[PDB]
């Protein structure tokens, strides 16, 4: 019943459709420049992902815009964090570059980098969070009914509820031995929110100081409403 109006199969298909094709990673002057180039690249891919999430494209265009402007940073952080469960002390960018812990610290962004590894990557790895679960968490973030200016917040709330009902059913069916798993997935969202806020504070500083190239789409997301 859950699955029919918001099927987890379609959310997984959205994840699998937009995955980068990187055969072998290489280490990234400034890793922050590489991270900002990857973020700009992945904003284009994020729009394609969101179109593939059931019912998103049926929202009013102005509400699609508000949800992606509100969510992009958390959506991108969730994706690169999950991609990075494969490495021990680093993150894997969609551009095929790795950023090592040591490189991040050496660039003056060690503290936030460590939060990503400890609160997101390591926790995703420890519970073996799967791509369906990641996709559902991302769809919950996308359908954020608290986003300011939505024409019909109740319809976004209803889409969020359909995702989390579908995710719970999926978790009970696939992981019946882990009754806490659904709650454990949801309880990564406060850490994601906090880390997203701190990453956005960094990006605004990088823009202010002017010593870090910021490409057109990432720049547009940093513009005032």
């Amino acid at each position: 019943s859950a699955n029919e109006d918001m099927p987890v199969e379609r959310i997984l298909e959205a994840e699998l459709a937009v995955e980068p094709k990187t055969e072998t990673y290489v280490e990234a002057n400034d890793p922050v420049t590489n991270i900002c180039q990857a973020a700009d690249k992945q904003l284009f891919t994020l729009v394609e992902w969101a179109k593939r999430i059931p019912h998103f494209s049926e929202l009013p265009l102005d509400d699609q815009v508000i949800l992606l402007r509100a969510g992009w940073n958390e959506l991108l952080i969730a994706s690169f964090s999950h991609r990075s469960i494969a490495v021990k002390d680093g993150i894997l960018l969609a551009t095929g570059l790795h950023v090592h812990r040591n490189s991040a610290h050496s660039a003056g962004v060690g503290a936030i980098f460590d939060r990503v590894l400890t609160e997101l990557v390591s926790k995703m790895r420890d519970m073996q969070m799967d791509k369906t679960e990641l996709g559902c968490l991302r769809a919950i973030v996308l359908f954020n009914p608290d986003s300011k200016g939505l024409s019909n917040p109740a319809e976004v709330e209803a889409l969020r509820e359909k995702v989390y009902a579908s995710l719970e059913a999926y978790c009970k069916h696939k992981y019946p031995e882990q009754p806490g798993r659904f709650a454990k997935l949801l309880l990564r969202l406060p850490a994601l929110r906090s880390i997203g806020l701190k990453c956005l504070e960094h990006l605004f500083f990088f823009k202010l100081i002017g010593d870090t190239p910021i490409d057109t789409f990432l720049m547009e997301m940093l513009e005032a409403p």
Binding site: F44, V47, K51, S57, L61, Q64, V65, L68, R69, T216, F217, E220, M221, E223
Partner: peptide, 12 residues
């Protein structure tokens, strides 16, 4: 404003 985002959302 949001020129790029509107363009990418339209194109079906």
């Amino acid at each position: 404003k949001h020129k790029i985002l509107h363009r990418l959302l339209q194109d079906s």
